[PDB]
Symmetry: C2
Subunit: 93 residues, 2 copies
């Protein structure tokens, strides 16, 4: 079931997408439901960091935008960026 495809804490987002769509191509649902799955279920089953970024992208983001947005998750640049964002929020408050 597509509902069982969940992104691991350190799984690259592109591999998660690969598994998700391999299971999706076999799911017995209409193209409307499958569109909802690529739009909402894909984001909901991502790991916390990727899910935060995707949520920040807002509705209507294309698959390519999502894959680009989560490319660096788990790396030093991502950690430093989150820390910088937190520092910025404490400063702005």
């Amino acid at each position: 079931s597509i509902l069982d495809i969940r992104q691991g804490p350190k799984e690259p987002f592109r591999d998660y997408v690969d598994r998700f769509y391999k299971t999706l191509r076999a799911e017995q649902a209409s193209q409307e439901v499958k569109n909802w799955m690529t739009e909402t279920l894909l984001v909901q089953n991502a790991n916390p960091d990727c899910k935060t970024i995707l949520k920040a992208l807002g509705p209507g983001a294309t698959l390519e935008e999502m894959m680009t947005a989560c490319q660096g998750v788990g790396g030093p640049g991502h950690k430093a960026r989150v820390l910088a964002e937190a520092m910025s929020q404490v400063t702005n408050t």
Copy 2:
């Protein structure tokens, strides 16, 4: 909270899980066809392993009352 995070607890009565599920469903933002899929498929998939076994064994077209009676 998303309807996808409504999962039946190990010792949660199936009726209470249905109540939670539909409570969150009435608030979910999705087309009527997606919601129909949620009641047809998601409701079963998010049940605990035993109730999921029973519901799966009922076959398709089972009404909500049939599902609740089966998992009583």
